[PDB]
Amino acid sequence: LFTGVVPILVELDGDVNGHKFSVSGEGEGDATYGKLTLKFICTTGKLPVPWPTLVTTLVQCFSRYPDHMKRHDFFKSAMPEGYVQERTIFFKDDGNYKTRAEVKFEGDTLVNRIELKGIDFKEDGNILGHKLEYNYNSHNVYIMADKQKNGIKVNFKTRHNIEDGSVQLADHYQQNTPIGDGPVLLPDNHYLSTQSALSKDPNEKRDHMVLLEFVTAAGI
Amino acid sequence: LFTGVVPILVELDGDVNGHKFSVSGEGEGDATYGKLTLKFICTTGKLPVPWPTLVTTLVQCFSRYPDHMKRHDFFKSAMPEGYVQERTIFFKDDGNYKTRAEVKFEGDTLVNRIELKGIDFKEDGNILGHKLEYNYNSHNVYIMADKQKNGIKVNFKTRHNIEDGSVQLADHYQQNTPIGDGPVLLPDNHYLSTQSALSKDPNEKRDHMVLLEFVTAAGI
């Protein structure tokens, strides 16, 4: 499945404090190197929220799991059927995103379709206030197996550089469970070390985000 | 000069607590997009220090200066003759790098040749102890004009994720002055917003670092 380069498609529908929009993404992933190369176009015009805030929301299976941690790769063990990924993202002293996605294989393409709903977002907030910088730092995504659910409960904090130099924090409460009924690899506690660089397509006129990302699993 | 893609060559000679080594780098830069794409091979074997610590040391002229800040682009205004870049990097509660480089044009290639000397580095330190993660965050590089010197004094702090989750800080004291005698663009206070992603060449056997970086000037 993931032994080669894989086409990714990301569809998303969102509503933030009433502001309704969409984003369509296309790119490829290479799990053996943990590389992502996506391109997001906002298909409703101008994105009512900063692009960096949707990064964690817009395909954890492309992480590179060193050979000795392969029995810890839940993400891929759910494929090709897929898993539902849910999250509650609390931006500090601001609003919160609630998202549910189904990432699974459709054809040769790995598809991540999401619904985003955010509320309680201040208009003088860095988010709606659009005071966030166009960049991203590296974080540690902490994975844990959830027995009952036969999934994993992931949780981590994100740091968003604000233009005034300060940093906007975002607490992610994530849950993943298989869509199929089959046996799945439940893992030992470990984390994924992610790095991301946001950029712009020179020949693109529509509002968008170019994202390059490297993810490798570590811990065990 | 920088209106197109430019070949970059990075030569470096180092001594850290007695450990003497070298690194040769090759890649290209595109100032109009602020992109860097370099590839570093350590030519003496295994690098006695972690690769992330040499990132700030291993070509500020490829930063993208939005059109309205062009009179603030000192880096490029010193070209093709070049500028000498000096720094004193203090790693918190550990040693310190002292470096001097001459980045200037040789042929069609922009060449950055450095000498690195580091001392007072603990062997149980994260640096020598090699306890630093293979990744990088985004930072703000603060530029200021230095009258007397007819250069710029830059200063910023770097955050290095340690594998135990904590963060290793590095205080950079930088100075840049032209090599040529001609007039140079001294700027108003501003900063460069940099993002970097470290990676590995799949087909490379020698110890190395692949670096992708985007830098854009902001402030004014």
Structural class of chain A: mainly beta
Q: Could you say which overall geometry of chain A the principal axes of the C-alpha atoms support?
A: globular
Compute the number of strand runs of chain A.
11
**Fraction in beta strands of chain A:** over 45%
Number of helices of chain A: 1
Q: Which H/E pattern describes the elements of chain A?
A: EEEHEEEEEEEE
CATH third-level topology of chain A: Green Fluorescent Protein
User: Reading side by side through the largest sheet of chain A, how are the strands ordered?
Assistant: 1-2-3-11-10-7-8-9-4-5-6
What's the helical proportion of residues of chain A? Answer: under 10%
Radius of gyration of chain A: 17 Å
Distance between the termini of chain A: 24 Å
- The quaternary organization reads as homodimer
Spell out the CATH superfamily of chain A: Green fluorescent protein
What is the second-level CATH architecture of chain A?
Beta Barrel
Largest interface: A-B, 25 and 25 residues
Largest sheet of chain A: 11 strands, mixed, barrel
How many domain units of chain A? 1
Query: Tell me, what is the CATH class of chain A?
Result: Mainly Beta
Family (chains A, B): Belongs to the GFP family.
Pfam family, one (chains A, B): GFP
Protein name (chains A, B): Green fluorescent protein
Function (chains A, B): Energy-transfer acceptor. Its role is to transduce the blue chemiluminescence of the protein aequorin into green fluorescent light by energy transfer. Fluoresces in vivo upon receiving energy from the Ca(2+)-activated photoprotein aequorin.
